[PDB]
Write a protein that binds this DNA or RNA. Sequence first.
DNA 1: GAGAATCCCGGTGCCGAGGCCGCTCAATTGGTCGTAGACAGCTCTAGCACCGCTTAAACGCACGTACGCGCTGTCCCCCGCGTTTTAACCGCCAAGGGGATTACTCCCTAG
DNA 2: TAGGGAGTAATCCCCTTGGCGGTTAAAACGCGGGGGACAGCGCGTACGTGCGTTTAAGCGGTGCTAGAGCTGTCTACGACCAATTGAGCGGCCTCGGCACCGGGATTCTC
Lengths: 97, 97, 79, 79, 93, 93, 108, 106
Amino acid sequence: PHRYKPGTVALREIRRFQKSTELLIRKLPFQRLVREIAQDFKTDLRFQSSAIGALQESVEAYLVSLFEDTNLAAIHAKRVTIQKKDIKLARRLRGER
Amino acid sequence: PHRYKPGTVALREIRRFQKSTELLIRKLPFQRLVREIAQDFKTDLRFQSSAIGALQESVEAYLVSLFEDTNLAAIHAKRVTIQKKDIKLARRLRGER
Amino acid sequence: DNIQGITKPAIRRLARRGGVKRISGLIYEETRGVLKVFLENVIRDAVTYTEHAKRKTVTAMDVVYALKRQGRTLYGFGG
Amino acid sequence: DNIQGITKPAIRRLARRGGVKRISGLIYEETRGVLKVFLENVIRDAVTYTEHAKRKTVTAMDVVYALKRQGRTLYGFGG
Amino acid sequence: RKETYSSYIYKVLKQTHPDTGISQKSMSILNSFVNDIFERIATEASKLAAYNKKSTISAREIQTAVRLILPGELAKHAVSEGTRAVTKYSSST
Amino acid sequence: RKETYSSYIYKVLKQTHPDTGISQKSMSILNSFVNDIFERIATEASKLAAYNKKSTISAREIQTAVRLILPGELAKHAVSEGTRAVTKYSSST
Amino acid sequence: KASQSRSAKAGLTFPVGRVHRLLRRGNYAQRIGSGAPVYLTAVLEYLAAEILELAGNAARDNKKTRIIPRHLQLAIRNDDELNKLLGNVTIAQGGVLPNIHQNLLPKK
Amino acid sequence: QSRSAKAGLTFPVGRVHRLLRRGNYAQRIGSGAPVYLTAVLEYLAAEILELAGNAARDNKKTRIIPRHLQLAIRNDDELNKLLGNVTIAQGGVLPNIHQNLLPKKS
DNA sequence: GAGAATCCCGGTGCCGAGGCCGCTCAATTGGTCGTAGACAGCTCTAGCACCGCTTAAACGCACGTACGCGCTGTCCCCCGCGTTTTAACCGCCAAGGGGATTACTCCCTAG
DNA sequence: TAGGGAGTAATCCCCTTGGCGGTTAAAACGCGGGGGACAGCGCGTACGTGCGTTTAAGCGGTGCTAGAGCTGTCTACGACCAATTGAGCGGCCTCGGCACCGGGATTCTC
């Protein structure tokens, strides 16, 4: 059969994901995560679905901006594969410690 | 015939300026610079003496805060010498464009 | 299985939204770690706005005010 | 030639404050181009405060408020 | 009873694009945007009036706040539109 | 005829340290610190009062404010000492 | 005796009196002058008109007749003074502009 | 009788009440609220003065200098991120030397 | 093993950091009233819980190949140092231009 | 309808912009030398690809009840006003901590 070069259909997946505007995290594991993370500060806490959407949009923008910052720090380091020290450098030079 | 290794006296004077906290910028050339950069909008400008000292402290703090960041970018770049590309990545990661 | 409630291709989806090419395997738990240190700072401020208002449910208002605080503001839910 | 007011050993003094063993020679003019935009960005918000005060002199009182407006609030000269 | 700007901005869109529809979420973003802009401009003006030891807000402190906040060509177009509007309104004679 | 805070910080410093001297640049520094903390706390308290449809500022809103901005062990130290002062005032009414 | 509002006296479609109300009981100042709501209303007029212009051109650029938040996001992020003003705000359901680094392409 | 002495504090409750009421924050204002703000300002002032005093005695001086103030603010991490956006005057930077920049071996 | 280069101990004006009195506004006390915060009480939206079908998304094992990484040889461009030289800085004298402030007034903004 | 907040303006005094000049740390400039950055080449493995096999997300439907939210009523906290006393700003006065200078011990570096 006919195959593809590794890193060429990944460009197509990149342009598909950078066209598509849809949501990239499933709603029930995220709502379980935010409920068990809000249980620590205060019990018997109910939630709103609009608050769920606002929270998920905030964290989705946060990983997106942090992630091209990590990618730019990685190509800065004459490499293509990202590593954990790129994340630590991006966090340290972005200001949050 | 006593010749020092290059960088040892650099680190020693780095230590002396680490105990030091005085102004490292000459006063009158910086006064000339701020007058020639403030003349362009409304001429015949009177200046107070303390404003120039405040400008000195702010430019020195911004320079050292950028230089620690580009030192971190340089030591992350597996090098000892800095470059313009470290300075651009410092400005990109700190976010002043 | 709550902190790993997000799945392995979820960081991949957030990755390829970000224009990356090659991704390692040790970064997934580290991205989950920055999830933890981000959501603590978000929902501690959210629950301060919550029980200040004498309510035991979070609405759409206190979350966007919590987001308004640190300078990562978000539109769309301002009303 | 007045733009040549800032001198290269002063940039070296600022560099060794950062604790750097090796400095290349292009860093001086890079920092010159960096600083030139930077001080003009506070001269932008100082002289308009001065003009709205109906004053033709600047002081230590409006420059600290310009830095406090942009977001590097500085102590020592009041405010 | 709740307040929104929706009919005014709808009319602004019909002045330049008559055949264009609207998502309600787009009104939510743009209402938040105009409220946020009014927010920063108004507290910048109040802060500047508290600086000059004045108890009155007039057109000149919000003019200076517009010059402070907006970028330069938007600042000059905004003060042009504001000055022509306030001189048209001031001609009530 | 300006107002300073120098006598009170001098009294506090002599309460904690009976031998330390101080310079005037440091007094300007920490007067600016006190005014910055006061101003940030005050605009946050006014914001939380206007946000809860509330026309009076009472100690609950500054309690929520010093909960939300100040660091946590300083936050509960400040809450403890401020509540101690609150009961000291309400006892000695 | 009957006369209309100040908005058409200034020739504006945004409410001058509502802005005056919000400036009065928004506790920004103890005294509010007459010409301040007119100036602020005109500034909001021009800002909303320019944002609607860029949104309408973006919606024409996708061959649609409705304003999607994608159109608002691309109109804000494409243009650079709107990039500087709105850099710190994340648009709800906006997405990310397409960009690839030159070294990441299959250069060969 | 002074309200500061009634509340057991050494800070001018009347002055901060004046600054709060003629500062245009709310139409009405509380009575125990300036006392509460007075107490928390006294606490932060006392704690930063204690830290500056310790940073004075460890470097043999009986005088407070802004370098000692920088030494007092930067070591405490919670105070450091409290003032992560604040530039001090005549304070300097802490001495940190990178391990890769440190030469030789052992 | 030597040698710059530090750290450490002792004498010196000094000039800038603690008291002190004078006193002038600004914190304190008392009375009045009209409204706003608190509590009680009320109606329904909306949030939680669970059952069950569908299935597309996710885990896991297998392998193959670019890409991270270790080593290497090399220009060469930064680093220590001697020599001019050039502008920065300190002491100072004089001007006059610009900020502070007093003082009445009227208009326009609060109600 | 009212009243008090800018507005005008004049006057005093203070600081700051030029202009002196010496002298002196300090920058400019040229020169020897040494590790550091540069590309290049090989070794292996880790991430991409793929198919079989779950699984537990998603829809959607229903049932229940807390709790959001609006209204009514009350009364006591607080703005407002008039008199008062005291305390914190300031000019003035006085003296010792620290920088500065001089000279000897001491530690990395070569």
